[PDB]
Every structure is written in structure tokens, then in C-alpha cells.
Design an enzyme around this catalytic site. Structure first.
Site, PDB file in Angstrom:
ATOM      1  CG  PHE B  24       3.602  -9.593  11.777  1.00  0.00           C
ATOM      2  CD1 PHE B  24       4.384  -9.942  10.534  1.00  0.00           C
ATOM      3  CD2 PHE B  24       4.187  -8.458  12.390  1.00  0.00           C
ATOM      4  CE1 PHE B  24       5.536  -9.593   9.972  1.00  0.00           C
ATOM      5  CE2 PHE B  24       5.569  -7.786  11.972  1.00  0.00           C
ATOM      6  CZ  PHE B  24       6.224  -8.485  10.609  1.00  0.00           C
ATOM      7  CG  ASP B 133       5.745   5.584  12.165  1.00  0.00           C
ATOM      8  OD1 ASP B 133       5.502   6.673  11.288  1.00  0.00           O
ATOM      9  OD2 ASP B 133       5.301   4.475  12.340  1.00  0.00           O
TER      10      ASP B 133
HETATM   11  N1  ATP Z   1      -1.768   0.080  23.753  1.00  0.00           N
HETATM   12  C1  ATP Z   1      -3.083   0.621  22.914  1.00  0.00           C
HETATM   13  N2  ATP Z   1      -4.093   0.889  23.395  1.00  0.00           N
HETATM   14  C2  ATP Z   1      -4.812   1.710  22.675  1.00  0.00           C
HETATM   15  N3  ATP Z   1      -5.124   1.365  21.336  1.00  0.00           N
HETATM   16  C3  ATP Z   1      -3.849   1.062  20.783  1.00  0.00           C
HETATM   17  C4  ATP Z   1      -2.883   0.455  21.391  1.00  0.00           C
HETATM   18  N4  ATP Z   1      -1.851   0.020  20.557  1.00  0.00           N
HETATM   19  C5  ATP Z   1      -2.325   0.367  19.526  1.00  0.00           C
HETATM   20  N5  ATP Z   1      -3.778   0.677  19.599  1.00  0.00           N
HETATM   21  C6  ATP Z   1      -4.480   0.916  18.309  1.00  0.00           C
HETATM   22  O1  ATP Z   1      -4.236   0.086  17.130  1.00  0.00           O
HETATM   23  C7  ATP Z   1      -4.426   0.616  15.888  1.00  0.00           C
HETATM   24  C8  ATP Z   1      -3.155   0.191  14.874  1.00  0.00           C
HETATM   25  O2  ATP Z   1      -2.016  -0.283  15.686  1.00  0.00           O
HETATM   26  P1  ATP Z   1      -0.703   0.025  15.350  1.00  0.00           P
HETATM   27  O3  ATP Z   1      -0.142   1.078  15.087  1.00  0.00           O
HETATM   28  O4  ATP Z   1       0.008  -1.417  15.843  1.00  0.00           O
HETATM   29  O5  ATP Z   1      -0.702  -0.608  13.512  1.00  0.00           O
HETATM   30  P2  ATP Z   1      -0.686   0.378  12.380  1.00  0.00           P
HETATM   31  O6  ATP Z   1      -1.970   0.898  11.768  1.00  0.00           O
HETATM   32  O7  ATP Z   1       0.374  -0.477  11.515  1.00  0.00           O
HETATM   33  O8  ATP Z   1       0.311   1.325  12.884  1.00  0.00           O
HETATM   34  P3  ATP Z   1       1.450   2.273  12.016  1.00  0.00           P
HETATM   35  O9  ATP Z   1       0.595   2.296  10.599  1.00  0.00           O
HETATM   36  O10 ATP Z   1       1.817   3.385  12.675  1.00  0.00           O
HETATM   37  O11 ATP Z   1       2.458   1.244  11.816  1.00  0.00           O
HETATM   38  C9  ATP Z   1      -4.390   2.295  16.265  1.00  0.00           C
HETATM   39  O12 ATP Z   1      -5.683   2.796  15.723  1.00  0.00           O
HETATM   40  C10 ATP Z   1      -4.278   2.410  17.763  1.00  0.00           C
HETATM   41  O13 ATP Z   1      -5.415   3.473  18.229  1.00  0.00           O
END
Ligand code: ATP
Ligand code: MG
Lengths: 251, 296
Positions: B24, B133
Site C-alpha cells: 500500500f 509467510d
Molecule cells: N521494523 C522494520 N525494521 C527494519 N526494516 C523493516 C521493518 N519492517 C520492514 N522492513 C523492511 O521493509 C522491506 C519490505 O517490507 P514489507 O515486508 O512490509 O513489504 P513486502 O516486500 O511486501 O514484504 P512481503 O513481500 O514479505 O509481503 C524489507 O526489505 C524489510 O527489510
């Protein structure tokens, strides 16, 4: 933690009171919202649990906002719309709009889903859901007295009848009182069961140890508070046309 | 303007960098304007979303608010102006560290990781939540060496017609590929199996391309899927599409017998014979020399 619990004095100094709304008037605005919630909810074919959840949203929401600014007829649909998504029974935005409209205006007919007027009221709801989430601080997980009533009523083998009446009181406490802003759910449950017993002329026997049925539900609950609270609930029940009839023994 | 006691404006935080992309919106590293505390801002955007505030985001928020544990990401709050999920900031991640030939784990350390991992699972399952996941990219570690289970965007509660296409392909367990929809906590534990093996091999052990390819690659590691191995595996419908007929494949990379025994109990085909987070924490692996050690 005790953020959404209020004293009798904080309930007097409500946001609505600032803008001129009489105490008694406010209690009605709450009951009418609750009513509109129950109507929309049965038509939308969602659960009493969803309606209850939406009702608590409403209750909390007006401890922060004022009825003079956000009318219950605007807030209730959006709240129910949210509550249904949160409780896993999501209903479509177009769908909640269509039902909200028929309840508020049984006679008028829905605008053209192409018009600038309908396109607007869809956005108004979407905006209001957003305002509700922010007012509640995204705290959407709501605990209801019912959970705890259904626990106890079994662990005292209440008749099917007494159990139903307890559920009844529980739900009606959400429509008619502001208990959910003042007392934890297990306490509200005790009030509901206590009044249900008094009403069905049923006496629950002092458990073998010597403890009263309620001490197995909440350590804070006294019989002095149970009697004070059932009296309040009973009184508003008697002012509400046809309610008590539903649980009255006609035999 | 309308009163908002309990939803603070995200200006509160000072942004320092994009660090990822979300479902999002963008994810930032950021800093409390007063105390310098580091946080991850994970934005949520409502434009492509037609049903108002995303039901899928509400679920995540509901789940995160409930799970409060040393080994699970901490949602600090929600902020406005759009909406941002504010998290405690976490410097590294298992995937990235595994990719880095520079970084090296002792046996003493790898044990500690598996422990914090299994303890986070023990916790979330005990609270009726499936992660769904499990993968190295979703295990975070903070600067102080504390592992956090992260990314609950696919997570849901439980107690039997649950959705099927869950878990990234490589980490997905046999039963989901076999068309199961009455699954529980064991799917997360299979994932802990592949993540554990991954701790030595440095590389996701079972890399597929299709569901029939993964399910085959699985068989050529865990043996063929037979009712002698998996009582009543017949009942499954899709069991009539591509038949076929583990310690030795990982023997090389791992070496330690205990590590090897546990990974075998984690990667078990029958979800009801696969070890749980409780028995795993108790498995000899965590209780024989060298004991588990903190992280640097
Ligand atoms: N609390 C946090 N502290 C540090 N980095 C974070 C944190 N939360 C998320 N990230 C970073 O944000 C990036 C992506 O976040 P998120 O998992 O929300 O999206 P995504 O790529 O859609 O994940 P997924 O594909 O598993 O659903 C990751 O590379 C992760 O390292
Ligand atoms: Mg990720």
C-alpha cells in the site's frame, strides 16, 4: 488501558455538551444510532456481534467528537461498514450505502449510481470511516459482555430460557445504556445475568465454597453495585416500548 | 479541523531513507524528532483501494496489536497526516545476512537464532495466529542481536476452510501443495525447517518454479508421499497428479548430528507427525554443547 473508560462526570462533560446538547438529548442520539445500527445490520445480514461492535465504536466515537458536528445518521453507517470488515463479514460500500439510504428514507429512492450526488455520499462514508479509525486510535478489537455471559450461564446450568434472557439484557445494555463506556465487559455481564435472574424469579445457589456466582466472573463485583446497576438498566428497559414484552412470561 | 487525541501526525518522525516497497506504500527508516529513536514507517495508501480502508491492512493491525513478545516485531503506533504503521527499527534480516559471505555464524550462534525463532512461533501459535509467510526475508534481527518475527501481512487467526495459496513457494509445506485447507501451526514449522537448513547452506534448500515442481523437489528430499508415510494422504483430491517413489543431502553442509536430527523432525511430510515449536525448543539441539550464544 483505562482510556475508553469514563467516570460519571466525564460522561456529563461530553464533547456534545460543549456544543449545547442536553444530557438527555445525547442519550437519545446514542439510542437512535444504536437503533439505526440494528436496522441496517439485520438487513445487511451481519451478526449481532458485528452490530454490537459498531455500537461500541459509536459510543466511544462520541466521547471524542460531538453529535452537533457528526450526525448519528452519518456516523452509524460508516461505523457498521468498518465493524463488518473488522469482524470478518465485510459488506460492499455500494451495499451499505443502499441499505443506509432505505432505512433513513424509506420513501425516496436511491440516486443514480452515475450521479455526482451518489458519487459524493460514497466518498462521505469513506471519509467518515477514516475519521472513526483516527478517533478510536485504530483500537478496533472490542470485547463484549456476551462472551462472559455465555461462560457463566453454563457454569451455573441456567435454563435455556435464563441464558437467552441474559444475552438479551447484554445486547440491550448496548442500545440503552452507556455501560460499555463505564464498566468492563465481565461486570456488564454480571449485571445482565443478575437482572435476568431477578426477572425470571430464578435464584442461583451459593457455590459449595461459600462464594457467590459472580466472584467466579470478576473479583471487583459487589452485590451493592449489581443492585445499583440492574436498577438503572431495568428502568430504561421500562421506558423502552415493547422491549420487555419480548422477555415477558405471558403464561 | 477535527479533534484527534489518539492518532499523532507522522511529522513526529523525521524520515531518513526509503528502505522498501509495500503493498500500500513506501517503507522508510526514520527518527523521533525529540529522542532520536529509530523506527520503520510502513505507509498505507488508499487510491487503488475501492472498499475504503483496506480490510487486509486492518487484519494486520489487529494481529500486530495483539502479539506482544520479545521475538515479534513491535507495532508502536499508527500515524496520520494517508496512514503509517510505525514499527521499532530492525537493522538486519536473515536473508541478507545469509547472502553475505562476509558474515559468519558459529554453531553456538545459529542455535540462538533457531531458539528465538522457535520461541516466536510458540508465542504466536499459542495466541491462535498463523504467520503464513515464513521465509528468511521475514526474520529480522536488531542491532542488539534480538530476532523478531516480522511481516504479518498474510497472517490470520485460527481455531477450517482457510485459503490455500499462502506462503512463498519455496517455503510452502507439502499439505498446502496437496490442496489442504484445514491446516494449522505446522505450516509455519515446515518454514522454520527450511529456514534452519538455510542457516548452513546459505541458500534456500528447495527452489521450485511451479507447484508440481516444488512438490516434486520435496519428494526428492523427503521421500515419496505415501499413505505409509502419511496415514490417509489418499483422501486429498490433487493426489492424482504427479506421483513419485534428507539427512544425507544436508549431511555435507551441517555436520552436527543434533542440528541434523531436528531439521529432519521439522521437514516431516505428515503435518501431524512434524515437530511442534514446544518439542523443538526441548530438542537436544538447544541443550547440548556448545550451548546457544548471543549475537555480534
Ligand atoms: N521494523 C522494520 N525494521 C527494519 N526494516 C523493516 C521493518 N519492517 C520492514 N522492513 C523492511 O521493509 C522491506 C519490505 O517490507 P514489507 O515486508 O512490509 O513489504 P513486502 O516486500 O511486501 O514484504 P512481503 O513481500 O514479505 O509481503 C524489507 O526489505 C524489510 O527489510
Ligand atoms: Mg519482506
Amino acid at each position: 488501558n483505562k482510556r475508553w473508560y469514563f467516570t460519571r462526570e466525564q460522561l456529563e462533560n461530553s464533547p456534545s455538551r460543549r456544543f449545547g446538547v442536553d444530557p438527555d438529548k445525547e442519550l437519545s442520539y446514542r439510542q437512535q444510532a444504536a437503533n439505526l445500527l440494528q436496522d441496517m445490520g439485520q438487513r445487511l445480514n451481519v451478526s449481532q456481534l458485528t452490530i454490537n461492535t459498531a455500537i461500541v465504536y459509536m459510543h466511544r466515537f462520541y466521547m471524542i467528537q460531538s453529535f452537533t458536528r457528526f450526525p448519528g445518521n452519518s456516523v452509524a453507517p460508516a461505523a457498521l461498514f468498518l465493524a463488518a470488515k473488522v469482524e470478518g463479514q465485510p459488506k460492499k460500500l455500494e451495499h451499505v450505502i443502499k441499505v443506509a439510504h432505505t432505512c433513513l428514507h424509506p420513501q425516496e429512492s436511491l440516486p443514480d449510481t452515475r450521479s455526482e450526488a451518489y458519487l459524493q455520499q460514497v466518498q462521505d462514508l469513506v471519509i467518515l470511516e477514516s475519521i472513526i479509525l483516527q478517533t478510536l486510535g485504530f483500537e478496533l478489537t472490542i470485547d463484549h459482555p456476551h462472551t462472559h455471559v455465555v461462560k457463566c450461564t453454563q457454569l451455573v446450568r441456567a435454563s435455556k430460557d435464563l441464558a437467552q434472557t441474559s444475552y438479551f439484557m447484554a445486547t440491550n445494555s448496548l442500545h440503552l445504556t452507556t455501560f460499555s463506556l463505564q464498566y468492563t465487559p465481565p461486570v456488564v455481564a454480571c449485571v445482565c445475568i443478575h437482572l435476568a435472574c431477578k426477572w425470571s424469579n430464578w435464584e442461583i445457589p451459593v457455590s459449595t465454597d461459600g462464594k457467590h456466582w459472580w466472584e467466579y466472573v470478576d473479583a471487583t463485583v459487589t452485590l451493592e453495585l449489581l443492585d445499583e446497576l440492574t436498577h438503572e438498566l431495568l428502568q430504561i428497559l421500562e421506558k423502552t416500548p415493547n422491549r420487555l414484552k419480548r422477555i415477558w412470561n405471558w403464561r | 479541523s477535527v479533534e484527534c487525541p489518539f492518532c499523532d501526525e507522522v511529522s513526529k518522525y523525521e524520515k531518513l531513507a526509503k528502505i522498501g516497497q509495500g503493498t500500500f506504500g513506501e517503507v522508510f527508516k526514520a527518527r523521533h524528532r525529540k529522542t532520536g529513536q529509530k523506527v520503520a514507517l510502513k505507509k498505507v495508501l488508499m487510491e487503488n483501494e475501492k472498499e475504503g480502508f483496506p480490510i487486509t491492512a486492518l487484519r494486520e493491525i489487529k494481529i500486530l496489536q495483539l502479539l506482544k513478545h520479545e521475538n515479534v516485531v513491535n507495532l508502536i503506533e499508527i500515524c496520520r497526516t494517508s496512514i503509517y504503521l510505525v514499527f521499532d527499527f530492525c537493522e538486519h534480516d536473515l536473508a541478507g545476512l545469509l547472502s553475505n559471505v562476509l558474515v559468519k555464524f558459529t554453531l553456538s550462534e545459529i542455535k540462538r537464532v533457531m531458539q528465538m525463532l522457535l520461541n516466536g512461533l510458540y508465542y504466536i501459535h499459542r495466541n491462535k495466529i498463523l504467520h503464513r509467510d515464513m521465509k528468511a526475508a521475514n526474520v529480522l534481527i536488531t542491532r542488539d542481536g534480538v530476532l523478531k518475527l516480522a511481516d504479518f501481512g498474510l497472517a490470520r487467526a485460527f481455531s477450517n476452510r482457510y485459503t490455500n495459496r499462502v506462503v512463498t513457494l519455496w517455503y510452502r509445506p507439502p499439505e498446502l501443495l496437496l490442496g489442504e485447507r484445514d491446516y494449522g501451526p505446522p505450516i509455519d514449522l515446515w518454514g522454520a525447517g527450511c529456514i534452519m537448513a538455510e542457516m548452513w547452506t546459505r541458500s534456500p534448500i528447495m527452489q521450485g518454479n511451479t507447484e508440481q515442481h516444488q512438490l516434486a523437489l520435496i519428494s526428492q528430499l523427503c521421500g515419496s508421499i505415501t499413505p505409509e508415510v502419511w496415514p490417509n494422504v489418499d483422501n486429498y483430491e490433487l493426489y492424482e497428479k504427479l506421483e513419485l517413489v534428507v539427512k544425507d543431502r544436508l549431511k555435507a553442509y551441517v555436520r552436527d548430528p543434533y542440528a541434523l536430527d531436528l531439521i529432519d523432525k521439522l521437514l516431516v511430510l505428515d503435518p501431524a507427525q512434524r515437530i511442534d515449536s514446544d518439542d523443538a525448543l526441548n530438542h537436544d539441539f538447544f541443550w547440548s554443547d556448545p550451548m546457544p550464544s548471543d549475537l555480534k
